[PDB]
Amino acid sequence: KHPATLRKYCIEAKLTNTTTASRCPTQGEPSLNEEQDKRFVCKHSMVDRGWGNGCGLFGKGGIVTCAMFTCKKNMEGKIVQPENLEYTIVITPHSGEEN
Amino acid sequence: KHPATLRKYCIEAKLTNTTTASRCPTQGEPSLNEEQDKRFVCKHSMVDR
Amino acid sequence: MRCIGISNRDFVEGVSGGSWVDIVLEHGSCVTTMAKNKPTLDFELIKTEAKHPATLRKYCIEAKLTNTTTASRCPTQGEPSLNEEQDKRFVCKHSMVDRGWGNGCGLFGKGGIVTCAMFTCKKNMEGKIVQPENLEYTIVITPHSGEENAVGNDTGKHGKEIKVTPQSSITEAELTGYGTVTMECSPRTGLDFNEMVLLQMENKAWLVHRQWFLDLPLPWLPGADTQGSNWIQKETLVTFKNPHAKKQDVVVLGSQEGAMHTALTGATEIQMSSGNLLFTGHLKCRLRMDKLQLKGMSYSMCTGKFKVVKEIAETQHGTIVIRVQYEGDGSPCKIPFEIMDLEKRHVLGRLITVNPIVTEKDSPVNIEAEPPFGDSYIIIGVEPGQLKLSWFKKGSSIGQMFETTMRGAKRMAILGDTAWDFGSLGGVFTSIGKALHQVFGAIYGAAFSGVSWTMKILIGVVITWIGMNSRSTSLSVSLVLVGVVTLYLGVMVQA
Amino acid sequence: SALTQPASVSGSPGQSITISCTGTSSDVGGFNYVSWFQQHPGKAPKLMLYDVTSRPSGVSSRFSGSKSGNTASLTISGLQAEDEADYYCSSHTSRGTWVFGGGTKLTVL
Amino acid sequence: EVQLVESGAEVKKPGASVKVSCKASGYTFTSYAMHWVRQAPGQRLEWMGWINAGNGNTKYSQKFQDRVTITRDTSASTAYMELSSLRSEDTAIYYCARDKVDDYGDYWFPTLWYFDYWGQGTLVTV
Amino acid sequence: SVALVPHVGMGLETRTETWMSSEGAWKHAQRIETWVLRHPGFTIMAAILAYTIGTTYFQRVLIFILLTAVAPSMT
Amino acid sequence: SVALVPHVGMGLETRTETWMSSEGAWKHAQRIETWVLRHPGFTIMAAILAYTIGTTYFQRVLIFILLTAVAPSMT
Ligand SMILES: *[C@@H]1O[C@H](CO)[C@@H](O)[C@H](O)[C@H]1NC(C)=O
Ligand SMILES: *[C@@H]1O[C@H](CO)[C@@H](O)[C@H](O)[C@H]1NC(C)=O
Ligand SMILES: *[C@@H]1O[C@H](CO)[C@@H](O)[C@H](O)[C@H]1NC(C)=O
Ligand SMILES: *[C@@H]1O[C@H](CO)[C@@H](O)[C@H](O)[C@H]1NC(C)=O
């Protein structure tokens, strides 16, 4: 009786509002306003940069990709205190009744 | 000439809008809305109740 | 310039008698070919297309059950029967429950019970296959002209792309001004598409092994099936629950999409929405540079002043690219470009954009050159107003040798026994090495298929220890080599 | 975030006139995605320069581009009457968008 | 010849919606991304977003993000720019400019010569 | 399930990054570590049994590693 | 994947039947059998390695069994 929710797991999500930011080699990390929000899952990585894609240098430029994480289905896990633990027992004598 | 800034470092900060939340024992973790954005510095701890 | 700015660049230098060279082309990589009298070219595999896929199996990743029915039989009366057991769109199970007077039975025993439900697929993943004759590799050949396509699209040049198919595996590019290049490719050996399935699952496609695909534990349709209703392994997507011996029930096992995603780790993802495009794999081609000629070799030195309009930069491969503009007379002139020392007594570096020339006065040309490690000076132009550029290359020659050995070993790891063709000019040593690699790789792939990288490292360590603790030197050395190679491959296996 | 350019500019014919496009470390101080567009009245913009300095095939060689720190500059050397137009500076920013200058009106007189 | 042609001028009332098209010819429509750039009467050029004709991907300016919709028609080699809930500030010429996507079909890094070809410009008034 | 046969040692591998290659590289070892931390009792028994069975220290370590690696996964 | 961390050895089992006891009782052994069939080469080399390392048939057989059971698992 009266279980308490201990944790909700996400089993089906969706990603939206994906965004990316790049920086030229050796200039540090890119910045995304969405990195501040925790609803956005983000990752930093390196891409090849050079004259072709607008950089004066020819190194590994840092890049950050951010997408909004939204949960669609849950796996709630509840807990019960042993006090709210109604057990039910049925006692039937061997009365011999027909049924 | 024309140097590009590589990183900013904080030498003097301040804290404001402090909030706290607790959960009864063995019921998991407290949840604060302020924990949603990274402007707020947070930490989890256990206090007897 | 297309091949610059890509960290997986390869430099193939030298063509054999016959003016041909063997180059393997990879999708993420690029190849710059340098020959003595020939111009420098860039080769990139930019697309592999499989056409006319044929489904061989449609798996069910999510189903539902609708029409549950049960038949029950008293003990010693045999198993029951439902009319829907004959039905292939129903999934059935036989169990036993306690029976007796209380159940209206009269014999007090284990009465067999059968429960059936209709299996309906809600989501499936196709397993299309493609005939090896239907592949089409698209390749772009771009020469180091030092120029640009120019934005004015009324004339569009410098963009030769050649399509290579198993039927037409020989094709020539007509690079304007440089003659023509002939590619003699072997698409039938790049990838064994008779042992691969184009696995498509909810707007995401992977390239997977065919035996792996046929071994998946999900229910499947033959592939020609156009109505479902005959799923094979329906039992893998349902569970029959008989807690105690009261009732039997059947329920579905939820969407298998995430479990499939977990199963697909180690499978290369492809595109299958607008055609089946595979941006993975390699092509082995022979480069015919015989009818390939440098452009403007009849021209004369500029004898004018150059200005640097794009400041000299160092690419990821130890070379330097600069963009200079000519401001002088005699517009179609060879550009005097040398990598000398400070006193200009010795030639220290060799330029890569071979025979840099100026076609128009107001048309910058960008030169790529390979300087030496350490101090070097880039000289452009002649005595009046000659512009001398300094440069320091930070590496070491030993470091470059180590890096090249590492790159060659990595190429062997990926293109096992095909790494011998990446720059091969024929020869007997290359053939012997390739044959030995084929013989050894057959055994290695036989003995290490289906093993994760952690298991490879464990086995390599075990074999290395066994070789170390071996009385025989002939056995010890071979075992240690096998162990070290196994450790290397395990440390560089997942991709 | 708009790239800042002088509201107007004027130069006597046959002279050289320069235009400035000051941006941030992301738009014009971080990348070479600097382009100059010339727009005559009642007409669509015309790409005059790109990659800071490179000029289109049909674009005259009188047009030269420079970039220093967060500022990119466009210079005109002939100052012909046909050069009198409105010039816009654009850059591809670090966040994947395009920002345009406020545009400078060049007048020969 | 690589000519870009857009629909004709239109008059709309505040609170309405306007769709503008840009027909691309002379080049592979699927190989280039289509950008929409609007310019208010006697004001600066403003970037709105782009559509990748190869796969229909889009990126809008933070401004216009909620009102502008960009679509392409591979069959007609045509691009569309839907602006909903027009206001008095939306009166301006709406240009279309192209930029080639990479050989993968992904358009994330532009080419240095982006916006090399423009449409004539479509005028919208509210 | 399908997740238990994760298309790893099939060859077919290239320079291009595979699917879920960043995580699956170490997630198995992470899982084994978590299991060993959550079930200390079995690991002690595995060490004792390996010591009893393994004549040399090489055999003992090999047996212990195999036992502790197969205990959670065999589940 | 969660599917690699099932709820088997948690020690809560009652006389009542569990979620997939019938199905999952032999699933791992079936997987090992199928893997060993599809990849014989690793089986021969594992047998050779176990025979070499194991000084007594007990050690050799145990090592071979553990190697064969763990190879598909990480796979
Ligand atoms: C995400 O995009 C949607 C449009 O699909 C928009 O309504 C929403 O405001 C966006 N959220 C953020 C945080 O930008
Ligand atoms: C923080 O507190 C101040 C008052 O001290 C208030 O004006 C402000 O809105 C608060 N902000 C947040 C994010 O709680
Ligand atoms: C299954 O049940 C549905 C009711 O939802 C019924 O319409 C249909 O005829 C049944 N099909 C059978 C029993 O084969
Ligand atoms: C069980 O009891 C009910 C009511 O007492 C009776 O109707 C029935 O016949 C009995 N036997 C059964 C249900 O087998």
TrEMBL record, chain B:
It is found in: Host endoplasmic reticulum membrane; Virion membrane. It comes from the Viruses. Homodimer; in the endoplasmic reticulum and Golgi. Interacts with protein prM. Interacts with non-structural protein 1. This is Genome polyprotein. It comes from Dengue virus type 2 (DENV-2). The chain holds residues 51 to 99 of 495 of the full protein.
From TrEMBL, chains F, G:
Residues 2-74 form the Envelope glycoprotein M flavivirus domain. It is found in: Host endoplasmic reticulum membrane; Host nucleus; Secreted; Virion membrane. The chain crosses the membrane at residues 44-67. Homodimer; in the endoplasmic reticulum and Golgi. Interacts with protein prM. Interacts with non-structural protein 1. Forms heterodimers with envelope protein E in the endoplasmic reticulum and Golgi. This is Genome polyprotein. The chain holds residues 206 to 280 of 811 of the full protein.
